[PDB]
Design a protein around this nucleic acid. Structure first.
Ligand SMILES: [Mg+2]
Ligand SMILES: [Mg+2]
Ligand SMILES: [Mg+2]
Ligand SMILES: [Mg+2]
Ligand SMILES: [Mg+2]
Ligand SMILES: [Mg+2]
Ligand SMILES: [Mg+2]
Ligand SMILES: [Mg+2]
Ligand SMILES: [Mg+2]
Ligand SMILES: [Mg+2]
Ligand SMILES: [Mg+2]
Ligand SMILES: [Mg+2]
Ligand SMILES: [Mg+2]
Ligand SMILES: [Mg+2]
Ligand SMILES: [Mg+2]
Ligand SMILES: [Mg+2]
Ligand SMILES: [Mg+2]
Ligand SMILES: [Mg+2]
Ligand SMILES: [Mg+2]
Ligand SMILES: [Mg+2]
Ligand SMILES: [Mg+2]
Ligand SMILES: [Mg+2]
Ligand SMILES: [Mg+2]
Ligand SMILES: [Mg+2]
Ligand SMILES: [Mg+2]
Ligand SMILES: [Mg+2]
Ligand SMILES: [Mg+2]
Ligand SMILES: [Mg+2]
Ligand SMILES: [Mg+2]
Ligand SMILES: [Mg+2]
Ligand SMILES: [Mg+2]
Ligand SMILES: [Mg+2]
Ligand SMILES: [Mg+2]
Ligand SMILES: [Mg+2]
Ligand SMILES: [Mg+2]
Ligand SMILES: [Mg+2]
Ligand SMILES: [Mg+2]
Ligand SMILES: [Mg+2]
Ligand SMILES: [Mg+2]
Ligand SMILES: [Mg+2]
Ligand SMILES: [Mg+2]
Ligand SMILES: [Mg+2]
Ligand SMILES: [Mg+2]
Ligand SMILES: [Mg+2]
Ligand SMILES: [Mg+2]
Ligand SMILES: [Mg+2]
Ligand SMILES: [Mg+2]
Ligand SMILES: [Mg+2]
Ligand SMILES: [Mg+2]
Ligand SMILES: [Mg+2]
Ligand SMILES: [Mg+2]
Ligand SMILES: [Mg+2]
Ligand SMILES: [Mg+2]
Ligand SMILES: [Mg+2]
Ligand SMILES: [Mg+2]
Lengths: 205, 81, 87
RNA sequence: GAACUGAAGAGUUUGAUCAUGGCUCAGAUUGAACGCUGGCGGCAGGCCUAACACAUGCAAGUCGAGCGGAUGAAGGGAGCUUGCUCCUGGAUUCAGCGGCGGACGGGUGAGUAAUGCCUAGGAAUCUGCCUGGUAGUGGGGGAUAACGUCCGGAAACGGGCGCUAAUACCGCAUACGUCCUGAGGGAGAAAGUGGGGGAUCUUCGGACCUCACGCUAUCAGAUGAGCCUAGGUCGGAUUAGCUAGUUGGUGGGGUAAAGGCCUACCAAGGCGACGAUCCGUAACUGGUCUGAGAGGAUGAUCAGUCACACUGGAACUGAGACACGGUCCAGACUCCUACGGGAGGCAGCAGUGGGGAAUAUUGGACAAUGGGCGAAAGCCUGAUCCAGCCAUGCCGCGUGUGUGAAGAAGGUCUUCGGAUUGUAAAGCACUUUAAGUUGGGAGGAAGGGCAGUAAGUUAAUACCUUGCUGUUUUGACGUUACCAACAGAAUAAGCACCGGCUAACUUCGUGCCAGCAGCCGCGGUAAUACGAAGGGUGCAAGCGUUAAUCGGAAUUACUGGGCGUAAAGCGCGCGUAGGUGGUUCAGCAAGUUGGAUGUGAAAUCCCCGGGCUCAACCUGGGAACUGCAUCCAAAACUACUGAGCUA
């Protein structure tokens, strides 16, 4: 399904980046994002190993907005796939359609990217795809409808994402509102702070 | 007699047919002795419409096996190609 | 019965039984006469009974009342018994 | 080329410690049920208990190109008149005889511990419809149903008399194939219908030539079935002896076929601690769930085999039955009756009563794939294809989106300053997924008929067989999948938990009471454990609880444990079966090793692709199925054979 609720209470609990807003002003000066929520919030609360696994699994799930039946199916597929399942899980989870239409610069938030993809406003080769789970094969030209190219929400999201970094493996033409994926991202490409091995340790128990 | 007919695999409203050489007093998808090919009534994309094995079919006909009407039509159409 | 074809099959079956019984009795009669001819230790009447019994036995084997292997076995065994009696 | 790559521990005996040892927990799964709650779609699944009893409705018919009979149209003509009848004809329909099918498809798992199943084999058998060869389809007869007539009956109907048809039945005619008989000889069958026609005898009635179907005798091929041998198939020894048709032989009988399968004589044999007999329990397999593996549990869906059809027996019909909506006899239980006699079998599809924790509609159509019947139209099909109810399972999508500090009001706590629910709310501004409405809209559909044309068999432009051409022609699902537009954020979140194991705390109320609990355990007047509030944590159209299996459990230890004191060495010898065997030379080839060949059904598992917007799901190819059997080669070790040696 989907998650509805506060989008920074989660950040306050987790205490990390956890991209969940447009990023207009900042990440901090909205919710004092350094304390866990509720009355009992100032306590750091040193937590055991099981705490570590639960915390990072929730971190990845919340950043990528995936439910747990789907997430465990993803993990099983990654384990099936050869060659160091830890990064296979990340590579396979990255190729989701909604996260691609976000990272291609067409949406302000993951939730807004899902909003756009569900209401049948984005193409893959001209064919209507509206499942926010489609695994995009390398080569496909993800684009927005010729009808929808004049919507201003895409324009504002694009100008906001204009300054967020360059991934250096996709080839994007911005005038026509189209994307292109050449080959799957490497492990070094993604943020090398959260480790993949601790997840596979969690699911191996 | 022993006859060659169609066994209905696939899913609901998505047929698929195995060309089976079965004894006529058997179920539609019961025991058989050999399978010569298949017919796909949906095709689309890289899926092939029909394929059979010619030599085994000729052997079965040379042993006197009656093909059904639709099976006869499809086998003669394949023999055309 | 319930379906009329079942009734027709039934009545045709009693007709077929009342037919087949008489012919089975006839063949058994002929072989029995032959067997009691040999067992009585006489050759000429055994010859005559065998010659009068083979035609009906073979005609009945062909007619489909009994099976042909049975008729051939009867013929061979009775001929062997008579030939043994000949000495 | 790819077919796998995989193994976690925690709590609890003590004042504390190490070991042993049981209990409980974290995982994956169910044909599951219950409690709270509940939007949609796709694919699957759905009486596990009473093989308990059953109302009604449906689930096997078909052929007029087999046969009499009766229904006999349209008409070519006539009578009188406008209507009927009739001559000749004649398109439709079917009660009965006859030919196929009913032994398939469908259901259930009672029985069955071996006449079943699985693996490998082999010899003495049969087999309609199907295919390929070969040889023929000549001539007679006696009946009978229906049909009249009479008697009897409540009915199903029964009986007497008369007559008729055939592809119904039985003689007769011959034997390329067949059977027996030793050579010798002998024995054994046929049915004709429909479409055309050159010539001939003649009523081309018919004979004659051709084609189509059909019939007879036989060889072969498949397809299906029968029979035999070896190995494996649950627990119990608090079940140790079982068997007289029993074990073998001879003569005969019998079956399609080998056989004590049956019988009369001959002898006393046969099986068994490698578990016979007996008791309990149970369909078997491919496979399914777990596990790192070895193993452990199991046989829901789908497929192969077996058994049964209210209970117990028996045979007839046939190619095949001991016969699932066939027959006969007996029984139990419901029903009709004129009191003489009759009827029934939902373990076929819906349905009901009852049992239970618990499992659904008395729905559509032959449209498609198959089946039966016919030459062809076509009929029958609760098999099949689709619908209905059900959060039962798996997969997927929705309940929106950005900004938003006055950090708004209420609630909770407080150190009374403030914090917290919280960008959460309100406010501003955007899209229409799904559902709603309207309009477009494939694909499941092959084929069927009518006319022409060209090829082929005769002896023939005759029929017919075959190609093509042109015209016409069908859908239950179905308001299809799918597409487009429209208004409106509109319209759709719950459950468990928060002492440790295990992620998540404060206050109020009781005061060893009321209550909680998987294990340690909480509660007797500040309970993070009870009951409520706020606040959090975890899952999510679900969430928990119960019942069941494997894992963790190296806790039945082959892989992989132990026995001085934790449980565990017989009180001690001798010895049977069994297990094991110092050293040398040589042989053989059972074990052992390598290879080849046949099988290991399909599906499922694994790897690489294809299709439905992805997935679930469907599907191509490959891999695999460690198993089993038959051969070829080697000789180190074990076994077997022969000859030695002395530790
Ligand atoms: Mg879901
Ligand atoms: Mg004759
Ligand atoms: Mg005959
Ligand atoms: Mg203590
Ligand atoms: Mg201890
Ligand atoms: Mg009729
Ligand atoms: Mg069956
Ligand atoms: Mg049952
Ligand atoms: Mg027993
Ligand atoms: Mg006849
Ligand atoms: Mg055996
Ligand atoms: Mg005796
Ligand atoms: Mg003997
Ligand atoms: Mg004997
Ligand atoms: Mg025997
Ligand atoms: Mg025993
Ligand atoms: Mg069982
Ligand atoms: Mg039982
Ligand atoms: Mg069992
Ligand atoms: Mg059983
Ligand atoms: Mg597994
Ligand atoms: Mg283990
Ligand atoms: Mg069942
Ligand atoms: Mg089966
Ligand atoms: Mg039976
Ligand atoms: Mg019976
Ligand atoms: Mg009953
Ligand atoms: Mg009975
Ligand atoms: Mg018979
Ligand atoms: Mg029957
Ligand atoms: Mg019945
Ligand atoms: Mg039923
Ligand atoms: Mg009930
Ligand atoms: Mg009840
Ligand atoms: Mg059909
Ligand atoms: Mg009917
Ligand atoms: Mg559902
Ligand atoms: Mg429920
Ligand atoms: Mg904790
Ligand atoms: Mg509780
Ligand atoms: Mg208190
Ligand atoms: Mg409490
Ligand atoms: Mg174990
Ligand atoms: Mg256990
Ligand atoms: Mg021990
Ligand atoms: Mg002691
Ligand atoms: Mg001692
Ligand atoms: Mg002893
Ligand atoms: Mg001793
Ligand atoms: Mg010894
Ligand atoms: Mg030795
Ligand atoms: Mg020894
Ligand atoms: Mg070997
Ligand atoms: Mg297989
Ligand atoms: Mg050698």
């Amino acid at each position: 399904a989907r998650y509805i609720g506060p989008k920074c209470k989660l950040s306050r609990r987790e205490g990390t980046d956890l991209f969940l807003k447009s990023g207009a002003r900042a990440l901090d000066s909205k919710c004092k994002a350094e304390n866990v929520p509720g009355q009992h919030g100032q306590r750091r609360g040193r937590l055991s190993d099981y705490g570590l696994q639960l915390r990072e699994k929730q971190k990845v799930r919340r950043i990528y907005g995936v439910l747990e039946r789907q997430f465990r199916g993803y993990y099983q597929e990654a384990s099936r796939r050869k060659g160091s399942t830890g990064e296979n899980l990340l590579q396979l989870l990255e190729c989701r359609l909604d996260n691609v239409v976000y990272r291609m610069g067409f949406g302000s938030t993951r939730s807004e990217s899902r909003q756009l993809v569900s209401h049948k406003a984005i193409t893959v080769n001209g064919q209507t795809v509206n499942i926010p789970s489609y695994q995009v094969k390398a080569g496909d030209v993800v684009a927005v409808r010729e009808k929808s190219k004049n919507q201003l929400r895409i324009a504002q999201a694009l100008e906001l994402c204009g300054q967020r970094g360059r991934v250096e493996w996709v080839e994007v033409d911005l005038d026509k509102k189209a994307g292109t994926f050449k080959s799957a991202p490497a492990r070094s490409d993604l943020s090398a702070d959260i480790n993949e091995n601790l997840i596979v340790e969690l699911y191996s128990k | 007699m022993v006859t060659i007919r169609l066994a209905r695999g696939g899913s609901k409203k998505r047929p698929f047919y195995h060309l089976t050489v079965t004894n006529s007093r058997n179920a539609r998808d019961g025991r058989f002795v050999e399978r010569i090919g298949f017919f796909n009534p949906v095709a689309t994309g890289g899926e092939v419409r029909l394929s059979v094995d010619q030599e085994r079919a000729t052997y079965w006909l040379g042993q006197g096996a009656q093909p059904s009407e639709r099976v006869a039509q499809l086998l003669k159409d394949a023999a055309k190609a | 019965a319930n379906t009329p074809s079942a009734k027709k099959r039934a009545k045709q079956a009693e007709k077929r039984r009342s037919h087949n019984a008489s012919l089975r009795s006839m063949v058994r009669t002929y072989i029995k006469n032959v067997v009691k001819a040999i067992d009585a230790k006489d050759l000429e009447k055994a010859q005559a009974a065998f010659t009068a019994a083979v035609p009906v036995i073979d005609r009945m084997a062909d007619k489909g009342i009994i099976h042909k292997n049975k008729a051939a076995r009867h013929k061979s065994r009775l001929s062997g018994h008579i030939k043994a009696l000949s000495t």
